[PDB]
Amino acid sequence: QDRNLLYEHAREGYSALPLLDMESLCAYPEDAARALDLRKGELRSKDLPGIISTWQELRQLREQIRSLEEEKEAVTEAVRALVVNQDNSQVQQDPQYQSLRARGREIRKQLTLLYPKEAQLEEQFYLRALRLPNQTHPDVPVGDESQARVLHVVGDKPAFSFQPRGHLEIAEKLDIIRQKRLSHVSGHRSYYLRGAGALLQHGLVNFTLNKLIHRGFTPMTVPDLLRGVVFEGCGMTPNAKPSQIYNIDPSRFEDLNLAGTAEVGLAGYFMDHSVAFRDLPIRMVCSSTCYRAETDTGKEPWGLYRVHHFTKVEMFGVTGPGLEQSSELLEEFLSLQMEILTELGLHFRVLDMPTQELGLPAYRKFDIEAWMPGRGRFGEVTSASNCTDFQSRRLHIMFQTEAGELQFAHTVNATGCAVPRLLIALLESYQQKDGSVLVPPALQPYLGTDRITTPTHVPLQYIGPNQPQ
Amino acid sequence: RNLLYEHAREGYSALPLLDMESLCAYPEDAARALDLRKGELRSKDLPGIISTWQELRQLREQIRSLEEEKEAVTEAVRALVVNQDNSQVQQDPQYQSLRARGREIRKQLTLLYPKEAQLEEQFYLRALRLPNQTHPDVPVGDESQARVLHVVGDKPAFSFQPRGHLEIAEKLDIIRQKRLSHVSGHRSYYLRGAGALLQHGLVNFTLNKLIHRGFTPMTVPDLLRGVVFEGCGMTPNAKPSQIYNIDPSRFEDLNLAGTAEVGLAGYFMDHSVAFRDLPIRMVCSSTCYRAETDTGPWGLYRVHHFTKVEMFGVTGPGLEQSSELLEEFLSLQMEILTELGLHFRVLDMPTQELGLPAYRKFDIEAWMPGRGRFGEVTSASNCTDFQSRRLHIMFQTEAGELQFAHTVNATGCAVPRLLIALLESYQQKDGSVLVPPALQPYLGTDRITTPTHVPLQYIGPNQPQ
Numbered sequence: 001q002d003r004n005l006l007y008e009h010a011r012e013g014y015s016a017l018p019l020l021d022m023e024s025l026c027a028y029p030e031d032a033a034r035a036l037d038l039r040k041g042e043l044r045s046k047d048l049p050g051i052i053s054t055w056q057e058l059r060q061l062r063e064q065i066r067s068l069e070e071e072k073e074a075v076t077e078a079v080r081a082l083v084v085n086q087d088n089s090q091v092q093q094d095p096q097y098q099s100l101r102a103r104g105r106e107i108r109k110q111l112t113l114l115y116p117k118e119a120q121l122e123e124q125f126y127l128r129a130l131r132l133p134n135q136t137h138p139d140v141p142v143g144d145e146s147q148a149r150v151l152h153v154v155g156d157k158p159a160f161s162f163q164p165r166g167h168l169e170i171a172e173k174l175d176i177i178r179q180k181r182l183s184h185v186s187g188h189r190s191y192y193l194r195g196a197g198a199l200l201q202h203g204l205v206n207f208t209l210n211k212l213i214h215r216g217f218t219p220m221t222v223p224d225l226l227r228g229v230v231f232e233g234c235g236m237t238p239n240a241k242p243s244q245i246y247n248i249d250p251s252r253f254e255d256l257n258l259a260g261t262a263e264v265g266l267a268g269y270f271m272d273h274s275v276a277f278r279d280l281p282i283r284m285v286c287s288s289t290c291y292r293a294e295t296d297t298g299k300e301p302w303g304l305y306r307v308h309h310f311t312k313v314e315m316f317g318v319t320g321p322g323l324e325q326s327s328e329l330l331e332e333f334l335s336l337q338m339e340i341l342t343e344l345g346l347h348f349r350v351l352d353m354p355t356q357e358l359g360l361p362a363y364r365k366f367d368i369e370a371w372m373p374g375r376g377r378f379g380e381v382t383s384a385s386n387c388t389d390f391q392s393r394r395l396h397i398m399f400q401t402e403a404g405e406l407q408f409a410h411t412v413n414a415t416g417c418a419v420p421r422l423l424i425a426l427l428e429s430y431q432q433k434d435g436s437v438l439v440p441p442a443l444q445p446y447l448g449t450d451r452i453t454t455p456t457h458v459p460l461q462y463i464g465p466n467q468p469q
Numbered sequence: 470r471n472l473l474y475e476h477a478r479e480g481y482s483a484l485p486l487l488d489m490e491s492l493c494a495y496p497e498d499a500a501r502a503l504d505l506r507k508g509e510l511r512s513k514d515l516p517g518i519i520s521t522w523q524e525l526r527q528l529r530e531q532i533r534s535l536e537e538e539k540e541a542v543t544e545a546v547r548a549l550v551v552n553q554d555n556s557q558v559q560q561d562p563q564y565q566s567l568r569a570r571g572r573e574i575r576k577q578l579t580l581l582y583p584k585e586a587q588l589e590e591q592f593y594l595r596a597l598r599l600p601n602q603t604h605p606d607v608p609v610g611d612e613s614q615a616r617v618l619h620v621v622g623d624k625p626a627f628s629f630q631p632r633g634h635l636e637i638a639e640k641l642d643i644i645r646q647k648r649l650s651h652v653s654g655h656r657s658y659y660l661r662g663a664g665a666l667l668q669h670g671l672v673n674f675t676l677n678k679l680i681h682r683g684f685t686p687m688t689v690p691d692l693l694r695g696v697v698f699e700g701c702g703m704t705p706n707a708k709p710s711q712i713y714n715i716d717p718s719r720f721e722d723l724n725l726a727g728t729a730e731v732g733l734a735g736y737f738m739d740h741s742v743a744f745r746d747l748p749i750r751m752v753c754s755s756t757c758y759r760a761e762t763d764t765g766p767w768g769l770y771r772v773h774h775f776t777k778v779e780m781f782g783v784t785g786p787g788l789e790q791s792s793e794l795l796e797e798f799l800s801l802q803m804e805i806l807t808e809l810g811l812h813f814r815v816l817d818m819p820t821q822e823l824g825l826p827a828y829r830k831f832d833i834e835a836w837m838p839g840r841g842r843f844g845e846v847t848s849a850s851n852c853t854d855f856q857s858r859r860l861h862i863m864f865q866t867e868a869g870e871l872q873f874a875h876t877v878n879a880t881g882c883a884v885p886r887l888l889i890a891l892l893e894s895y896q897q898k899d900g901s902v903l904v905p906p907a908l909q910p911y912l913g914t915d916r917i918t919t920p921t922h923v924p925l926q927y928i929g930p931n932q933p934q
């Protein structure tokens with residue numbers, strides 16, 4: 001179905017309709033069309049005129065409706081004013097019986113038709129307008145992913161005296177990651193972390209949480225299962241065709257979906273509420289389990305590069321009246337990501353993402369790719385996006401001055417630490433010839449050792465039927 | 470259909486190996502034990518189950534005899550042809566007699582094979598619904614018959630009427646549940662500030678303690694196939710299931726676990742561990758999801774999502790080992806709750822409250838002043854070989870033979886109700902909440918007070934103004 005969750009949500013009266021800045025769009029349609037085309041998303045410049053026109057038609061329809069409503073209360077007076085005036089038996093057939101009372105039922109007849117038309121026009125507008133992307137920062141590089149601009153390169157490739165191995169091989173030998181023999185247990189791409197592997201995840205998560213909490217971020221825990229409206233509000237797609245979002249059985253539980261990032265739950269917390277101006281900027285940090293269907297995306301059958309479940313610590317910000325505040329907060333979040341990766345001793349590159357890779361909600365987006373020796377490639381480990389007022393206008397995330405005046409806040413989100421790919425980068429960058437893996441000083445307090453070595457336990461032995469004999 | 474049987478039908482694993490010889494040997498003891506649990510099956514069902522099993526063994530013997538006779542016939546034919554050395558052997562009365570019996574045998578087998586598959590399924594579909602054995606000392610009866618084994622601490626004294634955790638938390642803005650119906654649904658919540666620090670602290674305090682006591686930390690998938698749940702003694706298909714399943718029309722056989730116990734069992738499934746490593750002690754922190762359709766609207770006592778650190782064990786050749794491990798897990802739970810400064814009581818759960826997989830089950834209830842009663846905060850169960858026989862969780866003996874291991878599970882710390890007990894036990898008259906020394910390193914304070922931020926204000930259309 002093409003039913004928009006934000007619109008349906010509003011239709012039921014659960015929240016108000018999203019408040020889009022049509023004044024700006026109608027004032028500068030040419031600029032909007034050009035930026036729209038450069039994103040190469042669903043909607044293109046050819047679609048804009050129709051969207052603007054539907055909005056304009058709706059505005060006039062509402063003007064016509066109001067006009068007819070006011071006129072009805074004017075005709076109701078042509079009768080009310082005549083209940084104690086010549087109301088013997090004259091009014092029942094006076095010259096003002098027809099033409100001044102028959103035009104009262106004609107108005108009712110019209111309004112009964114216009115109200116439904118208004119609803120139809122309104123849905124027509126939102127179904128399309130809500131698929132329009134956010135504006136684009138003037139400095140965003142134009143083009144596909146390959147056009148990303150390298151802003152910083154930190155460190156250099158680790159040098160080995162042997163061919164670096166992949167993280168899965170390294171981990172299986174140390175029995176800290178397991179993916180084999182799980183198709184009928186937990187499915188493809190699923191995995192278990194054991195011993196030092198689990199300690200590595202706990203260490204990464206706690207190192208990151210500790211750092212951010214110490215830096216003034218408010219810790220939060222959010223629901224993992226959320227209604228589709230929240231995803232739509234964030235600029236995600238609960239159900240495009242192959243959808244990245246897992247949904248709970250609709251025949252058993254109504255509208256429940258697993259989030260692919262704590263960003264969803266965090267946005268849901270602020271939905272329909274206002275924060276105090278004095279508290280801006282609001283900085284929050286949240287660790288949660290993320291779920292992603294990963295359909296039609298990169299083929300990564302083995303290894304932790306594109307898994308269905310993983311833990312991620314998320315940074316989320318709600319700020320000021322405008323761009324200066326949100327742009328600065330994005331810069332702050334990025335600097336924190338760089339600090340985390342630098343302290344982990346990883347080689348990485350910071351990228352200014354191009355127009356076709358911003359998505360729908362992003363105005364500006366900075367990603368960081370970490371060098372992964374075994375994979376032999378730079379791989380994205382974090383993303384940071386300034387969504388300006390795209391999410392706030394859809395989910396009504398406001399800020400309030402001391403006086404009570406409400407304005408749309410801006411929202412910013414950024415990866416604090418996504419475990420899977422950091423495990424890849426760490427295991428592959430710190431691997432030793434003998435198969436052991438050195439532990440970065442920053443994580444040693446969590447690992448209780450400076451080197452991960454072969455375990456004492458005997459690895460599990462498969463005793464099932466599906467084996468050669 | 471039974472997920473365990475289907476799983477085997479597809480050849481993904483062998484069929485569960487139930488201890489029928491023990492059952493058939495002492496059907497009377499099993500009969501009374503079954504009735505005392507007052508579960509699905511009762512004494513009036515054992516005779517049928519035992520009969521089907523016997524009919525199945527006989528059918529298999531009959532099939533074996535026929536398959537063996539078929540070979541004997543084929544050999545008699547080969548020997549006849551070689552012995553007669555004639556171009557017209559087909560016309561020999563004996564040759565035709567053997568060939569006829571050969572075709573008859575094959576016909577009879579075409580009848581027995583389908584019957585065998587049928588009986589086998591009928592047996593498992595019913596036999597798999599039988600509970601584990603029951604420990605001799607288990608108290609008989611319903612929950613009211615739970616036996617108090619020990620009590621630790623004393624009820625806190627207040628100079629005022631203790632308030633409930635939600636009121637306390639909303640005032641401090643550390644828990645939110647209001648206006649979430651269309652965001653995350655009923656019985657969902659957010660923890661903020663000190664509230665989130667409390668969860669972080671509880672989880673880390675428990676994880677650190679257990680890791681330092683020798684438990685191997687683990688991370689498990691949260692989405693698993695139905696077979697693993699069934700193997701643990703849970704019910705993904707009991708119509709009103711407490712297990713959330715991913716939309717079947719989009720993704721096949723994927724379910725959210727209500728405890729890391731499921732994933733941990735899935736790890737050992739179809740594998741064998743070395744005897745020298747027993748007992749295997751693992752600890753795992755995971756997000757748990759429970760539909761709680763049966764019953765429950767406000768408060769954290771019964772929610773749909775929560776974080777829980779789980780203890781899981783795989784041990785020795787028999788009962789002595791699994792029993793001692795359960796005791797070990799219980800003692801650890803008591804240490805954790807005592808160090809958090811909570812008042813609690815240990816219970817030996819009764820026959821009707823063991824469920825299907827448990828042989829022995831100890832629960833701990835913590836005093837919750839605001840609630841005005843004790844509430845279960847942990848459970849610990851010895852499942853002996855109930856899960857292992859269903860998921861083939863083995864161990865290799867000294868001699869080098871495979872035997873079914875025993876599994877044990879226990880709550881390390883379940884956050885929701887611990888928050889209730891902590892908030893309600895340490896609340897102060899002015900609304901602040903004192904922090905237990907053990908949790909102070911994680912909270913950075915000895916007292917949780919009113920937050921600095923201005924609480925969020927609802928600005929939606931559904932309000933008077």
Ligand SMILES: Nc1ncnc2c1ncn2[C@@H]1O[C@H](COP(=O)(O)OC(=O)[C@@H](N)CO)[C@@H](O)[C@H]1O
Nearest residue numbers: 261263305306307380381382383414415418420
């Ligand atoms: N299938 C998968 N397997 C392994 N790692 C994956 C993954 N999908 C995403 N990630 C990791 O999570 C980080 C997040 O995602 P993005 O989805 O880019 O950001 C957001 O979610 C924003 N809320 C900021 O974090 C990525 O940069 C990547 O390292």
Ligand SMILES: Nc1ncnc2c1ncn2[C@@H]1O[C@H](COP(=O)(O)OC(=O)[C@@H](N)CO)[C@@H](O)[C@H]1O
Nearest residue numbers: 728730770771772845846847848879880883885
């Ligand atoms: N809906 C809910 N809301 C809040 N807390 C809940 C809950 N369902 C269960 N719990 C908490 O998690 C612990 C777990 O469960 P049980 O299901 O008893 O055990 C097992 O799972 C075994 N694997 C041992 O932990 C319980 O003792 C209880 O404190």
